Symmetry: C5
Subunit: 346 residues, 5 copies
């Protein structure tokens, strides 16, 4: 019989009336293109740019009655991408591309196969740099929702409808791990149908819920902001009434508390609102600034001066050091309980 | 009847006399191309480079009498971008491109449709990195005006005229939020007609007013420059005449005031003029440098030495500490009122 | 006789029935493509992105019975890359490309030669930026395993099978040195056959074992974290009961221990788990934080006050300075033995 | 009559003997191409790379007698860039390109028009990243001279000559402002004719004089290097013979003078010679290092010890503090006059 | 007579038997291609990536007897790069490309001219980013040897041989200066013939010797590491037996010695071996760490306590300050002689 590439030329080229510029079922019902993606790679989720890079296999299935052969004995004719400009393909695009490219190493990484009844599978490999608005109200404990939406660009709703297939519309690779996030298994699949002044265009989208790994910030952000507060509590014991060294422990633990406060937001977007790591680095700034402010209460009370008025100020310069030495591990411990319960509920 | 893509070939190709190199209404009135854009994405507004990235849908409408079919029953013939080099298109360009590319993922993201009377809609998707000169005289409280202008490159004013359409010439996407700025709703639409030695070329432009979010700099730039000034006011209470610790609080709050002064302009352009954050970080440098300069007045007066001359210098080393402890929260509070009223008016 | 380029046109083009879109041995056994690579350049192994760049010569050998000439006198007909779109080529791709390009300087860097029996050698030059997941549990002493896998994209397992040749399937250049790593000579070669819902696709992969050079981190990370611990041991000798200078050596060696702790992870991914350099910079932070905490035990015990109770606290303020001066070089030396034996075993 | 695009095809294509591979006036006098540029954008003048980005309109005018129509009624026939590979064009290149691209958004941004006598205007839009060697001997007060030169690549001097036109050979845009530099109005226009072993090739070049804005470095580099010198002069007043606090003001104002000295050259090329900002940060390092070296002369003389020898060293420990308190504002003020006069003359 | 472009079409195209896929002197001696380069630009020699960027004119001369016209009156026929795919060209490539591109601004920057006897000159413009392994054993005083090598890709040694011409095989531009290095005039030209399992391929290479400019590191690395050692020698004079200020000068000059030690390798590759700047920043770390360790010997000996035993320890607390004040400018001056003589010999 015929070879497939010679048989598929006479099914399409110039003699069968197949025109690649005209959609299937023309002047009839719209073409129902069904889609599913396979995420090979994921990540490099930046926050200065608020974008993330993904590497997908975009599979598109539709029906084309002009490609429905009947007499050839096989069940699926492939088509290499040299002759891929000879069929109709849906004009899918991503509504938040922000730059994207194909992969064309050793061959155009494109797949096409045509069944007997006309079902056309079309799988391409794309690298996307998708845009998602980061919501950083509770920054080390947030759950980001970064989406990707697949629209049509030229055909309206009465000509081309996108659908997610019911048999697992988003597959993820086997050992896909992210360095900072984890990809949750439940992925929302909903519609995003756009209305312009040109017309109404089809749109489908998949949500990805990206929960952070808190274990990094619990090593660099929280514990070196915890030990500086303990280091400011050393000043309550040194020389117990007055020294030129309690000031040096009161000055210096505000410096590296302030430097770490600016260092906690070194590679973050300049958001207007206050976030979760800001109400930690400003309350633990308050517990290390009140320690030097506590000595200024001591060295002003104890530097006041008959026979009765001698010990009456030392009795006010030891009660200020046996209460402010125990009440600060009560106020800081009741803040540390109210903080983490709030961000466990939210 | 005929399919549209076969009908549209005989409307243009080689038999109807349609030449795609010749503008409509030739040797007559100029072509009135009307334009409107749709900002999908906005942002990454850099200031080291003084540019911003935008992602638009550029729609262009004109009239072409050679494309006015009459006998075909429909109202709008589309045209896929494989045959888009066969019509006339206006040679629009952006006068401040600084690099711009199309989007060509899964299909050339281009749209064309031709009405019965000859009206041609032409929507393409462009990513621009536009240039706008930043005016940073009042830096955290400024209202930037970044423009984009759409010129003709080859046709003069007597051959091709650009207009903004009256029905919403600039649309913005629904949930378009910027991390640092806000986009005001009033967008100016004015002309920018260029005159060269080649001729006079048409130009239209849209201004975008970008107001900053002050809430970021009010957390990192102002409050850690506010607490260092309060930290320098602790030195008026410590030991009340003389210490080796008031110097240590006088030195160190100039260090991290100077380090934060260089740290306030880490990612900014090297502008010649003085800005709003510079007359905050240099006046709050003055209140923390005059505190150590105040102790140098104390430790020089109080280190002077009959029976009457003993208490006469302590009476000059306490009046210098009961006035300079209250006058500095008067001068700093009258500066802080004159500062913010100035930048609320401007 | 004929020149080779004219003889090779009639072997393939339009008269011999050779169709370049159809694989060899069609409707028969699968094509057995055998592969080997030649790593020219290697390196720029980043960890923020977790990727590495390689520069290979990808050689592919297969059999094509339609190219088996018999009457031409030579043994190997070459073919320049201008006519390289005329044979069948396997659609190999790398399953973790993350961007890759050819090299096209002065000529397409591509090779093709055809033997008499039909063996086809096909060598191209590719630059890859391959992805490998970094496992940083024991960070300066880890052995990374970064792989590269070579799948088919269009042909399933019953049409195209990849193999590594038995005669040295991965060659490395003569003087290939890495700045941070060393490439071990044993390279694993195993199968990675993928199963999708499209079909099952062939895959071969080569593991590369990249052992680090520990000598860099033993100069910047370990020795300047070793001398700060010795510098905190200077405070046990200074003035031997009480000073305002032991606090100044107790504060300051916690500052540059914490600053170096944040400086130890300046260009690393934000992993959740704790690594080998973190249980050094948090234990040597403990020995420099316990030194200031030791003086707080001294200056609180020695500041307590009949005739018998005078020397009883100095006898408790010297035993605390002749034991804590020797026990800290016992606890730090027994940690330093348990640390390096653990990472020598693992 | 004829449309212009059909008339211009028979003037060139295959019937008039016009060959686009052959220069005008062949085997005769050389082609006199005259050039002028229009700088749209300028800037991003880097110094680590020593290059600057420009965005020009390159206009080229020459004469081509084969394109001299006589009977067509118009005076100027345009030509869209689709048929622009059909005329002869000069093979101009930039001898210091370092990468350059065209602009191809919505149309190839290219212009061509042909007069009646044969004069051909050819305007294109290029983005260049031109290389200029920076001379940083006097760094914040220098006048850079960054050039751009336009050579021929294939035709020698006896076949093609470039000239600048006399009517404004370099135009600059209306509101072109640079953030760091200013572009002087006088632009030198001179020749740069190259001699290779291939031949001698034409070359023209324009010099651009880029004077800096000193006002930025006078806020960050000079004033925080001025106040540290005044801060070191506070140590002459504190306790007036001896303290543990004059050392703390002698140590610390060397630290942030050395840190600012390394911070003054954070983003500069690693030049070998000494520059103007180096002999400010090394002389003001000397005035803050000699202040601590002055106290080491005080605390060594005043710590020497009959009844006559008591006040003879205090008379040497007050003369050292009433001269070194006035002579240092004399030496620093006579340096500050000799410094700025030197860089005002040069 | 004929124009040259029409004469050169009948010399090659389809009638003269010229096939552009077949090398000259086929089934005979190999083609002797002779090469020389012209370095326009050089530099951006990075060391994190260990690569350098060069911008060359690659000239190639071979002989092609099929292009040997005899009857045309000229001596050299040029050929514009539109018809440059019609001759045979050698498939040269660079064996350490790491990315390279042509220059195609206003015309393909390519040159071709054919002499009467068949000699073909072929000059193109290439930008290369070449790889060279940096050897940093003696880092500020090293002489790098970065090479570039020119291989054949498709033709073996018995078909194509590269040579350097004897008339100046590497030219350098007139005013080519590097910011950090200097390019030595003696350039080695040697062979690098490769042996693969495909065959043996020709290769020629040019060594470039890049001697550094030590004058930058002698301002930032060595002098601020010299004054800190002098600053640690101030502590021998302050208060001469005991103070809380000698410790503060002993602590702080270890801090900024350690910070500058990490700051000396901010933008360097993470090499395993020790380099020349590391045995300066670790010996000058030793002279500033032994100064604080010297006071710990003083304040432990002088704090020991009949009538005879009073002055016997002051006699041991002044001999330790009149020897350790002169021996440290003897050990540091004998190190500073042994250091620079070692790196002057090597
Ligand atoms: C692509 O999918 C759409 C959506 O499922 C299909 O449109 C649907 O087609 C069916 C049968 O043609 C329509 O059912 C009909 O409903 C009318 C009342 O409107 C009634 O006379 C019958 O019950 C009849 O079954 C259905 O309304 C229609 N839905 C929409 C939203 O248009 C379309 O046929 C699919 N096209 C292809 C090529 O598969
Ligand atoms: C594109 O838009 C321009 C601007 O509206 C149109 O030009 C205008 O055309 C009208 C009618 O052709 C001109 O009005 C005429 O004015 C003359 C006096 O100059 C008088 O005899 C009549 O009152 C007549 O209506 C109008 O002057 C002219 N304006 C300009 C600035 O040229 C043009 O016709 C439009 N072209 C197309 C193809 O739509
Ligand atoms: C490509 O490689 C595969 C794998 O080596 C080859 O397939 C193998 O082909 C041989 C002979 O055609 C098969 O042996 C046969 O086994 C059957 C029992 O199944 C028995 O009747 C005989 O012993 C006979 O030798 C072998 O089973 C088969 N293996 C597989 C996994 O398919 C294939 O022939 C190679 N193709 C080319 C073009 O070199
Ligand atoms: C392009 O520009 C060059 C330079 O202006 C033109 O070359 C010049 O052409 C004129 C007239 O052809 C030459 O003048 C002649 O000088 C000879 C003595 O050499 C004498 O017999 C006459 O006085 C005559 O006028 C002039 O020497 C020559 N200059 C050079 C440097 O070649 C050229 O003609 C221009 N070409 C075109 C196509 O415009
Ligand atoms: C390209 O360059 C190579 C190397 O210079 C040339 O090969 C050399 O060709 C000469 C003459 O054809 C050979 O000399 C011959 O030597 C044999 C002994 O082997 C003897 O019968 C004669 O003395 C005769 O002169 C020489 O051996 C040969 N060298 C090599 C290494 O092959 C080649 O001819 C050049 N090709 C062109 C087209 O210029």
């Amino acid at each position: 019989p015929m070879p497939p590439s010679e048989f598929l030329d006479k099914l399409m080229g110039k003699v069968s009336g197949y025109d690649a510029r005209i959609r299937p079922n023309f002047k009839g019902p719209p073409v129902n293109v069904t889609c599913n993606i396979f995420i090979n790679s994921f990540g490099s989720i930046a926050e200065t740019t608020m974008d993330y890079r993904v590497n997908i296999f975009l599979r598109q299935q539709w029906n084309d009655p002009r490609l429905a052969y009947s007499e050839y004995p096989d069940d699926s004719l492939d088509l290499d991408p040299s002759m891929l400009d000879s069929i109709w393909k849906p004009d899918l695009f991503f509504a938040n591309e922000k730059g994207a490219n194909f992969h064309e190493v050793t061959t155009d990484n494109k797949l096409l196969r045509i069944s007997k009844n006309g079902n056309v599978l079309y799988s391409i490999r794309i690298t996307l740099v998708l845009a998602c608005p980061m919501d950083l109200k509770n920054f080390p404990m947030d759950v980001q929702t970064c989406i990707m939406q697949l629209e049509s660009f030229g055909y309206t709703m009465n000509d081309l409808i996108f659908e997610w297939d019911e048999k697992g519309a988003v597959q993820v690779a086997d050992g896909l791990t992210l360095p900072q996030f984890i990809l949750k298994e439940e992925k929302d699949l909903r519609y995003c149908t756009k209305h312009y002044n040109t017309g109404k265009f089809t749109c489908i989208e998949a949500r990805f819920h990206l929960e952070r790994q808190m274990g990094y910030y619990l090593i660099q952000m929280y514990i070196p902001s915890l030990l500086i507060v303990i280091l400011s509590w050393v000043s309550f014991w040194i020389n117990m009434d007055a020294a030129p060294a309690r000031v040096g422990l009161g000055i210096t633990t505000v410096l590296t508390m302030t430097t770490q406060s600016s260092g906690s937001r070194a590679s973050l977007p300049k958001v207007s609102y206050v976030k979760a790591i800001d109400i930690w680095m400003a309350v633990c700034l308050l517990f290390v600034f009140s320690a030097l402010l506590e000595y200024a209460a001591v060295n002003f009370i104890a530097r006041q001066h008959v026979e009765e008025m001698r010990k009456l100020f030392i009795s006010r310069a030891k009660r200020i050091d046996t209460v402010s030495r125990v009440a600060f591990p009560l106020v800081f411990l009741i803040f540390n309980i109210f903080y983490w319960i709030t961000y466990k509920i939210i």
